[PDB]
């Protein structure tokens, strides 16, 4: 969300100075996929306003860009449409006709699911990718029903289907109201898929965790199956504390992004020792040499740390440590 | 029991390569690696993991190079990274670092091709550190590819660090011989272009930079033009730099032409 610390008589000067700093960071660091020419003043974020509206300037969205994304990189990266945008773009809260094409696709993929394994894997991956364009709650209902039917029919020893299926089921559940009959198999699914050996299964399950934890005021029994994820985050920040060049790149990055999201928007559900250990492990992560921790990991973890600083949630001793 | 099942998974993987799908033949090669992890084999498990790596990288060469997909979002890049991570760990456990360095070179060449040069810089410097005790010329070529990746990704100070490291490791092992002199020529041109692009203060100006900037302020034509261009940028004489870019364009490769274009740009 846009922050509380801005819009003050003090905050505007801070936005100016950090606009200058991040402006020539994106001159130095960033990856000109938006940009073709060579000019200095080319910072551009395609975030629209929100029945669509105009385009938001880069100096107004100072820290809105998610920590899952490389600086100024433009590609599909599983976090394009937030469910804020799903709930308030199309008014559902618990000039091409794209809607007819999406209905015809749901008919086709629901008939093909209900065929070899390769087509089923590519159809569920297709359905998760095309799932940004759905403008009706009944479409997400049919999505979740067909995916639970595929989970019941298709066997369990197919992890490629799992790594293309878990974010689709989690987002189809997250657009809907997160009721107990929906929250039990989704949380059971996430707790099962976080123990797997396939690494983008973990990546897709953790993006699905980010979709579930995103906006829905969540069940008090289902938020008690959060600290499985917190124990996962503690173990895989202690493991990847020293060496980052060895393990992986996008796993650590998305994993720190959801860790920072859990510190920001759900404080009380986890203990303060968890946020303290994340600040300690990221202080270790910033303190690596220029060949140990890469530039993208460094800048994303750093941007998440000042994102947590501009939030009014953290205590003063962790602020002094930062 | 396990070996016959591994041969069955190998036949399934060959049938799927004949069917040419390839997210799922790699799953069978991971099954072959798991079966040869069930007993103790060694390099055959590494072969199964590297064949799975070849299949996932071929999936993304089909999904980003032959088909520039807007829906492509790097799902078997991560599986190829985990598989080659397991293979490099297995080679470092058995004790042969040349194979692990070869796999890091393959992964970083794949990430250079897919349009992501920093992680290529990345694994190239990792492989060049894995080849310094045994094969220093292969380490110089891995560092040269790392430096080209960093000049692609606009990390010029990292390119200074890599180029000075290349020149130091070429002087320790060239006393030149051969292609060590080609390494030295490429470094002695490109460090001067990078010292003219970013002009360091004398605090962060290391004495190797001081020695070569005292040397200029390699064949005779390009050496003469580099001396003239250092003397032109110290005097800020733009017409001379124009008449040098017209006459240094055939003499340089495309990376040096990019660096000389940047030097001519950021002084006008």
Q: How far is B56 from chain A (nearest CA, A)?
A: 12
For residue A49, which of A88, A5, A21, A100 has the smallest C-alpha distance?
A: A88
Task: Convert B17-52 to b/e letters by CB count within 10 Å (16 or more is b).
Answer: beeebbbbbbbbbbbbbbbbbeeebeeebbbbbbbb
Instruction: For Cα atoms B36, B37, B38, give the angle at the middle one, nearest 5 degrees.
Output: 90
Phi-psi region of A66 (alpha: psi -120 to 50; beta: other; left: phi over 0): beta
The minimal CB distance from A198 to the residues B79, B153, B161 is found for B79
- A130: nearest CA partner in chain B: B71
Strand partners, A26: none
- Which residues fall within 8 angstroms of residue A90, CB to CB, at 6 or more apart? A135, A136
The minimal CB distance from B24 to the residues A118, A295, A296 is found for A118
Q: How far is B90 from chain A (nearest CA, A)?
A: 13
Phi first, then psi, for residue A246 (nearest 5°) are -85, -45
The minimal CB distance from B73 to the residues A75, A198, A296 is found for A75
Where in chain B does DSSP place strands (E)?
none
Instruction: For Cα atoms A6, A12, A14, give the angle at the middle one, nearest 5 degrees.
Output: 90
Contacts of A159 in chain B (CB under 8 A): 27
Is residue A190 within 8 A of residue A212, CB to CB? The reply is: yes
The minimal CB distance from B79 to the residues A75, A199, A294 is found for A199
Contacts of A117 in chain B (CB under 8 A): 24
- A295: nearest CA partner in chain B: B118
Is residue B126 within 8 A of residue B103, CB to CB? The reply is: no
In angstroms, this model's resolution equals 3.6
- Which residues fall within 8 angstroms of residue A306, CB to CB, at 6 or more apart? A63
- A129: nearest CA partner in chain B: B71
Instruction: For residues A257 and B92, give the distance between their C-alpha atoms in angstroms, rounded to a whole number.
Output: 31
Domain count, chain B: 1
Method: cryo-EM
Instruction: For residues A20 and A25, give the distance between their C-alpha atoms in angstroms, rounded to a whole number.
Output: 9
Q: B172: domain range?
A: 1-268
At A52 the three-state DSSP class reads: coil
- How many interface pairs between A and B have CB atoms less than 8 angstroms apart? 64
Q: How far is B113 from chain A (nearest CA, A)?
A: 15
Task: Convert A2-23 to b/e letters by CB count within 10 Å (16 or more is b).
Answer: eeeeeeeeeeeeebeebeeebe
Phi first, then psi, for residue A48 (nearest 5°) are -85, 180
Find the radius of gyration of the CA atoms of chain A: 20
Q: Which residues of B touch A (CB under 8 A)?
A: 21, 23-24, 27, 70-79, 81-82, 85, 118-119, 122, 125-126, 153-155, 158, 161, 265
Is residue A77 within 8 A of residue A263, CB to CB? The reply is: no
Say yes or no for a CB contact (<8 Å) between A199 and B76. Answer: no
Packing angle of the helix pair B254-265, B238-248 (nearest 10 deg): 170
Cα B108 to chain center, whole Å? 6
- B161: nearest CA partner in chain A: A290
Instruction: For residues A240 and A238, give the distance between their C-alpha atoms in angstroms, rounded to a whole number.
Output: 6
Instruction: For residues B257 and A227, give the distance between their C-alpha atoms in angstroms, rounded to a whole number.
Output: 55
Instruction: For residues A44 and A57, give the distance between their C-alpha atoms in angstroms, rounded to a whole number.
Output: 7
Instruction: For residues A288 and B145, give the distance between their C-alpha atoms in angstroms, rounded to a whole number.
Output: 23
Q: How far is B82 from chain A (nearest CA, A)?
A: 7
In this structure, what token pair is assigned to residue A208? Answer: 């699905």
Contacts of B158 in chain A (CB under 8 A): 290
CA distances (Å), origin A73, targets B87, B115, B156: 30, 11, 19
For residue A84, which of A2, A166, A25, A23 has the smallest C-alpha distance?
A: A2
Count of CB atoms within 10 A of residue A97's CB? 8
Say yes or no for a CB contact (<8 Å) between B158 and A159. Answer: no
Burial class (CB in 10 A: 0-12, 13-18, 19+), A58: buried
């Amino acid at each position: 969300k846009p922050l509380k610390a801005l819009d003050t008589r003090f905050g505007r000067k801070l936005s100016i100075i950090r606009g200058i700093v991040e402006q020539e960071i994106q001159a130095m660091v960033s990856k000109r996929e938006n940009i073709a020419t060579h000019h200095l003043y080319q910072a551009w974020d395609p975030v629209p306003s929100l029945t669509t509206g105009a385009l938001i300037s880069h100096e107004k969205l100072l820290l809105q860009i998610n920590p899952e994304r490389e600086l100024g990189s433009m590609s599909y990266k599983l976090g394009q449409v937030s469910i804020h945008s799903v709930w308030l773009g199309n008014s559902i809260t618990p000039g091409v006709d794209i809607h007819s094409c999406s209905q015809f696709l749901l008919e086709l993929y629901s008939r093909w699911i209900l065929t070899p394994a390769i087509l089923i894997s590519e159809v569920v991956r297709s359905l998760l990718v095309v799932s940004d364009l759905f403008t009706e709650r009944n479409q997400f209902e049919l999505m979740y029903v067909t995916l639970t039917e595929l989970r019941r029919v298709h066997p369990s020893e197919d992890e490629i289907l799992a790594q293309y299926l878990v974010p689709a089921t989690c987002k189809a559940a997250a657009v809907l109201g997160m009721d107990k009959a929906v929250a039990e198999p989704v949380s059971r699914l996430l707790e099962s898929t976080l123990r797997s050996s396939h690494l983008p299964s973990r990546v897709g399950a953790l993006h699905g965790v980010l979709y579930v934890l995103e906006c829905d005021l969540l069940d008090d029994t289902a938020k008690q199956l959060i600290p499985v994820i917190s124990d996962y985050l503690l173990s895989n920040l202690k493991g990847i504390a020293h060496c980052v060049n060895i393990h992986s790149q996008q796993h650590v990055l998305v994993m720190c992004a959801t860790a920072f999201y859990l510190i920001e928007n759900y404080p009380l559900d986890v203990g303060p020792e968890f946020s303290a250990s994340i600040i300690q492990m990221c202080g270790v992560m910033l303190s690596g040499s220029e060949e140990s921790t890469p530039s993208i990991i460094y800048h994303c973890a750093l941007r998440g740390l000042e994102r947590l600083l501009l939030s009014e949630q953290l205590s003063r001793l962790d602020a002094e440590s930062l | 029991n396990v070996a016959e099942a591994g041969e069955q998974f190998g036949q399934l993987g060959r049938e799927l390569r004949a069917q040419e799908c390839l997210p799922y033949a790699a799953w069978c090669q991971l099954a072959v690696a798991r079966c040869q992890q069930a007993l103790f084999h060694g390099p055959g498990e590494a072969l199964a993991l590297t064949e799975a790596a070849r299949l996932f990288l071929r999936q993304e060469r089909d999904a980003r190079q032959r088909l520039v997909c807007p829906a492509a979002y790097g799902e078997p890049l991560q599986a190829a990274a985990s598989a080659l991570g397991a293979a490099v760990r297995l080679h470092l456990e058995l004790g042969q670092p040349a194979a692990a360095a070869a796999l890091c070179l393959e992964l970083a060449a794949a990430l250079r091709d897919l349009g992501q040069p920093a992680a290529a810089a990345g694994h190239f410097q990792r492989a060049a550190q894995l080849q310094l005790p045994q094969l220093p010329l292969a380490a110089l070529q891995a560092l040269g590819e790392a430096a080209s990746c960093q000049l692609l990704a606009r990390d010029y100070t990292g390119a200074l660090a890599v180029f000075t490291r290349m020149q130091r490791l070429a002087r320790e092992h060239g006393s030149a011989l051969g292609a060590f002199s080609d390494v030295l020529v490429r470094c002695e041109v490109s460090r001067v272009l990078l010292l003219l692009l970013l002009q360091p203060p004398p605090a962060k100006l290391l004495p190797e930079h001081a020695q070569t900037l005292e040397k200029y302020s390699l064949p005779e034509e390009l050496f003469l033009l580099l001396q003239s261009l250092v003397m032109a940028t110290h005097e800020k004489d733009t017409e001379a730099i124009k008449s040098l870019q017209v006459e240094m364009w055939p003499l340089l490769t495309a990376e040096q032409n990019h660096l000389l274009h940047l030097v001519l740009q950021e002084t006008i």
